[PDB]
Scaffold this active site. Structure first.
Site, PDB file in Angstrom:
ATOM      1  N   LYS A  30     -35.527  -8.782  20.187  1.00  0.00           N
ATOM      2  CA  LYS A  30     -36.372  -7.738  20.193  1.00  0.00           C
ATOM      3  C   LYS A  30     -37.412  -7.950  19.015  1.00  0.00           C
ATOM      4  O   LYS A  30     -36.763  -7.750  17.962  1.00  0.00           O
ATOM      5  CB  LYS A  30     -35.548  -6.510  19.771  1.00  0.00           C
ATOM      6  CG  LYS A  30     -36.589  -5.303  20.042  1.00  0.00           C
ATOM      7  CD  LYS A  30     -36.116  -3.889  20.087  1.00  0.00           C
ATOM      8  CE  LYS A  30     -37.170  -2.694  20.012  1.00  0.00           C
ATOM      9  NZ  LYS A  30     -36.294  -1.646  19.495  1.00  0.00           N
ATOM     10  N   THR A  54     -36.514   4.256  18.079  1.00  0.00           N
ATOM     11  CA  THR A  54     -36.948   5.508  18.764  1.00  0.00           C
ATOM     12  C   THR A  54     -36.107   6.532  19.428  1.00  0.00           C
ATOM     13  O   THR A  54     -36.413   7.752  19.392  1.00  0.00           O
ATOM     14  CB  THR A  54     -37.773   4.913  20.020  1.00  0.00           C
ATOM     15  OG1 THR A  54     -38.823   3.839  19.691  1.00  0.00           O
ATOM     16  CG2 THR A  54     -38.328   6.064  21.050  1.00  0.00           C
ATOM     17  N   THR A 111     -40.105  -6.689  16.804  1.00  0.00           N
ATOM     18  CA  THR A 111     -41.039  -5.849  16.361  1.00  0.00           C
ATOM     19  C   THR A 111     -41.772  -6.295  15.375  1.00  0.00           C
ATOM     20  O   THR A 111     -41.550  -5.790  14.135  1.00  0.00           O
ATOM     21  CB  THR A 111     -40.273  -4.386  16.340  1.00  0.00           C
ATOM     22  OG1 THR A 111     -39.742  -4.197  17.545  1.00  0.00           O
ATOM     23  CG2 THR A 111     -41.410  -3.264  16.122  1.00  0.00           C
ATOM     24  N   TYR A 140     -32.442  -7.555  16.935  1.00  0.00           N
ATOM     25  CA  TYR A 140     -33.523  -6.432  16.707  1.00  0.00           C
ATOM     26  C   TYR A 140     -34.128  -6.608  15.352  1.00  0.00           C
ATOM     27  O   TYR A 140     -33.491  -6.395  14.297  1.00  0.00           O
ATOM     28  CB  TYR A 140     -33.128  -5.041  16.751  1.00  0.00           C
ATOM     29  CG  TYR A 140     -33.990  -4.056  16.819  1.00  0.00           C
ATOM     30  CD1 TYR A 140     -35.267  -4.407  16.701  1.00  0.00           C
ATOM     31  CD2 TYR A 140     -33.217  -2.734  16.300  1.00  0.00           C
ATOM     32  CE1 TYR A 140     -36.204  -3.226  16.798  1.00  0.00           C
ATOM     33  CE2 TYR A 140     -34.362  -1.714  16.263  1.00  0.00           C
ATOM     34  CZ  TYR A 140     -35.612  -1.950  16.221  1.00  0.00           C
ATOM     35  OH  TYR A 140     -36.674  -1.007  16.248  1.00  0.00           O
TER      36      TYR A 140
END
Ligand SMILES: [Cl-]
Ligand SMILES: [Cl-]
Ligand SMILES: [Cl-]
Ligand SMILES: [Cl-]
Ligand SMILES: [Cl-]
Ligand SMILES: [Cl-]
Ligand SMILES: [Cl-]
Ligand SMILES: [Cl-]
Ligand SMILES: [Cl-]
Ligand SMILES: [Cl-]
Ligand SMILES: [Cl-]
Ligand SMILES: [Cl-]
Ligand SMILES: [Cl-]
Ligand SMILES: [Cl-]
Ligand SMILES: [Cl-]
Ligand SMILES: [Cl-]
Ligand code: NA
Ligand code: NA
Ligand code: NA
Ligand code: NA
Ligand code: NA
Ligand code: NA
Ligand code: NA
Ligand code: NA
Ligand code: NA
Ligand code: NA
Ligand code: NA
Ligand code: NA
Ligand code: NA
Ligand code: NA
Ligand code: NA
Ligand code: NA
Lengths: 296, 296, 296, 296
Positions: C165, C48, C167, C137
């Protein structure tokens, strides 16, 4: 031992009538039409044959009719594959009774099966084929089964397997298969790369568009054998102009429609949920038929 | 209008005998067993039912038997879907004759069909269902058909469609469907995310593992209704310990084997090319059955 | 040991100016804005944050500015991941110098690396982080790296790894990770399934839309803790109405534009090849900003 | 207008030293080595060049060195592509200053961009290239960007685009591109299908394995031109035996290792997270180098 299986063989369409029943008269004319194109064989009840919207008795009916018209004239390969092993075995034994030269089976699909289950599936069908060789049929785009080279290596070395119908655009894998099995009968399955698939290692092909222009594919084989690189490219260029159109209109129904305009099929329908051809394509499909007839 | 379709319904397995024929006696016991678990309905002849290794007459036979045992006791949904529209219509009309409350159809697969062809396919089946509602069945992992939200929106608003069986792990899309259709009956299809699928918008579920532990899923619904967040997570944790095992051993045959150790099915076989359970898993599957029986 | 990493943390956007240079003043206001939303931390230089259209010196500049505004107020996580291990190590050592509480690294992408190479990559970054924990991640949709559960298990048990993380929309895998690592800090990465991801096992989240409506996600955590199932669903419903819009307009630039209408960012531009927002969306994005401000 | 871009061009590797810095001396020897293989050009800073583990100043340094050795001797193509448009423009302007004959840019990746954003990205780079043509670079397997034929058609007709580097195994699409753009310079990107890619419509190629055996690929072009179908197949067979090995050991490091055994590169290392070659492959890689040297 199975070199009689090499060559160029249409994936036979299954003609239906105005009520979507099997059109037996048109089927018989389609077999003789393909024979008179000079093909090396026919592949019956495959994906192009709309096998998976037909019952077992319907598929057996088609197998027996084709054997009546073609046995001893051209090579006869029966696609017997179902998801069910038992159903595939029933069609294999039928194909044997009817005098077929070989059977074939798509990798069973929809449900995930282990590779050993796939192997056992082919073994069972080979058993029921009772002595005629098996053509393993790999079509990942439709089956959802993506076999590795090593898995393909194990299948094509199963006792009873005599050939591979390789409907894959990965021509690295095509070459790897040829290099690993220098004697294997290896059919290119995607007509739109026929010339490139032969160069990569295929020694023949089974294709749906062969039903309307087999002489072109036979011509590509000849060009490559003779060393006429440019002729092969030009023939494939023209083949792909036709494939572009068929993809636009719907392949099976487009071929059935061209054959209808060539006075081969009385009715060009596919079974639902395949829709009929849209009216706006009819002009171009008729023009294609006339072009192809004059081309001969 | 179709809120009677909401709830928790096992995807019924189809019992087979030692020769892989339909085991009618065990089927009848399986229906009564599920009824006595407290389920809201049963889903017959679906993916879990091994529909696609059965003939049409076999599937009709199963539909009629289940209706005999369950009609008027729990909700009856007949999965009638085939690749063929005509075949699906035949099973829809049969389900209507037998007294089913609804029909359902997987998106037709193997061949690529346009979205309009999919729509027309559902319309035809709805017609043959002769007044009982349709449950659209979306299972991209097996069908290879990945419907967009907008396509799902058009299907679930077809006249005659009363519900969606959403076998997808995309719980963004689940929420989008709920928000677009606040009254739609929306079944969570992946048992391993049941609790999360309900939170995202599903108001019920159709699942294969419900056949051996429906009370757990019924318990998750209750926990979420009561606000017991932790209880829902703990039940799902235990459900997924079981799903982990079933995935290791093979889901359908693992469930049939647990039901065999629970004295529900006389024979836990799936049809080839599904292999039998490996001997090394039997100990754990029997222990699971005993655990589940004592849990009740 | 690393429970101080649990919570709800915006994926910080990187403000740029009218010439697409870093807007340092607006960055500092964005950090204080997020702090005053009540978040547990911030995640800097992530996807992001437009990390992969910035140089290393630009990313270090952003890391140091954020540490100046936030160190000792909220938890500070530095996303240091690059394709290059050496580049990632440089940012890890910088993050350590600047006082960050943790580092994070996306799975290196574009080139295929073996799993051992991925492991060694994380080990090297952990080394350069010089004692602050690593947040693995996993973002398969953008990285093209789809890690198995067993691979995730090996990464999150590497010495130095304190969190994951996640996602991914696969909430079966989310639950499997929680069940295997009951103490692991596990961030839900897709905001559009936040509530379902928490129920499946996540104990927090890192998300881009938190920058404009963190109180909603904080509210979902509270609802689930309190047992208010319906409140969680209603908050997620409203969150996804916003996500639907942001996806239509472009997520990063849509959030930057809302923040511009909230007087947080002076310039809402993303770096090329991200285009600017289309004029036809401006009305709805301004209305959203006003709605969100009044909501507080 | 850009037919001077046709031919066979190695994807230049970027040599590194024992500390993974750029090895400038070995780079200069690698350029002269490729020139003395008879290639038509070199492609600098591409995927094979490990561009995406290098900084902008490193890539510019490599571009300028290669121009010093090769300008006016062979065709010079600079791969300038980054995710960032501005970064790509900087390398394009550098390539222009250094005297390159063309620039090239991979489709920007990791983030999803719309097709218009991709188009605008190429336009901006073309602008900064200040009059030398652009080679669009399509590599779906690594970029995650799968362009349709119609999208490719729009890119290769952008003002300033002179060629397409088609790193795709879909040789239907290859033929479609040739047929739509009879004059387009069209590089086959996958060495393992070089011969089939030329037959399908490619008029040249850019490949990583050309660095160690360009004469083979030059030989395939000659065979097809002369009509020696069998010679082309036999050369490709031998090329793919080498590619099989390189894939086993790791392609980039395998090629660097062969070049090290050919006394071209002093150090065969790739940058982390690429691991070094495993000791067990060294024997076969040295034998390959000796075979290739004797082959000349
Ligand atoms: Cl006739
Ligand atoms: Cl007959
Ligand atoms: Cl498999
Ligand atoms: Cl085997
Ligand atoms: Cl009973
Ligand atoms: Cl009966
Ligand atoms: Cl579709
Ligand atoms: Cl419609
Ligand atoms: Cl401020
Ligand atoms: Cl500073
Ligand atoms: Cl991997
Ligand atoms: Cl490891
Ligand atoms: Cl030199
Ligand atoms: Cl220099
Ligand atoms: Cl796109
Ligand atoms: Cl455009
Ligand atoms: Na027909
Ligand atoms: Na023959
Ligand atoms: Na297949
Ligand atoms: Na073919
Ligand atoms: Na059974
Ligand atoms: Na009910
Ligand atoms: Na589906
Ligand atoms: Na379920
Ligand atoms: Na900005
Ligand atoms: Na905190
Ligand atoms: Na990832
Ligand atoms: Na999130
Ligand atoms: Na090197
Ligand atoms: Na040249
Ligand atoms: Na690409
Ligand atoms: Na190549």
């Amino acid at each position: 031992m199975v070199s009689h299986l090499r060559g160029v063989m249409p994936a036979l369409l299954t003609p239906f009538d105005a009520q979507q029943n099997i059109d037996r008269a048109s089927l018989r004319r389609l077999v003789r039409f393909n024979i008179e194109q000079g093909v090396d064989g026919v592949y019956v009840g495959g994906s192009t044959g709309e096998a998976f919207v037909q019952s077992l008795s319907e598929r057996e009916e088609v197998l027996e009719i084709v054997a009546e018209e073609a046995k001893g004239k051209i090579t006869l390969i029966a696609h017997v594959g179902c998801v069910s092993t038992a159903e595939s075995q029933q069609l294999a034994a039928a194909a044997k009774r009817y005098g077929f030269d070989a059977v074939s089976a798509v990798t069973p699909f929809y449900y995930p099966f282990s590779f050993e289950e796939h192997c056992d599936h082919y073994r069972a069908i080979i058993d029921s084929a009772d002595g005629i060789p098996m053509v393993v049929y790999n079509i990942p785009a439709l089956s959802g089964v993506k076999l590795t080279l090593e898995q393909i290596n194990q299948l094509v070395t199963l006792p009873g397997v005599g050939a591979l119908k390789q409907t894959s655009g990965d021509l690295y894998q095509m070459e790897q298969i040829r290099r690993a099995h220098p004697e294997l009968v290896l059919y290119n399955g995607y007509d739109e790369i026929f010339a490139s698939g032969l160069l990569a290692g295929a020694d023949g092909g089974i294709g749906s568009t062969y039903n309307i222009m087999a002489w072109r594919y036979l011509g590509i084989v000849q060009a490559l054998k003779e060393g006429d690189t440019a002729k092969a490219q030009q023939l494939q260029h023209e083949c792909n102009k036709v494939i572009d159109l068929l993809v636009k209109v719907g392949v099976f129904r487009g071929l059935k429609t061209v054959l209808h305009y060539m006075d081969v099929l009385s009715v060009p329908l596919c079974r639902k949920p395949f829709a009929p051809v849209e009216d706006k394509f009819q002009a171009e499909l008729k023009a294609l038929a006339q072009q192809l007839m004059q081309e001969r």
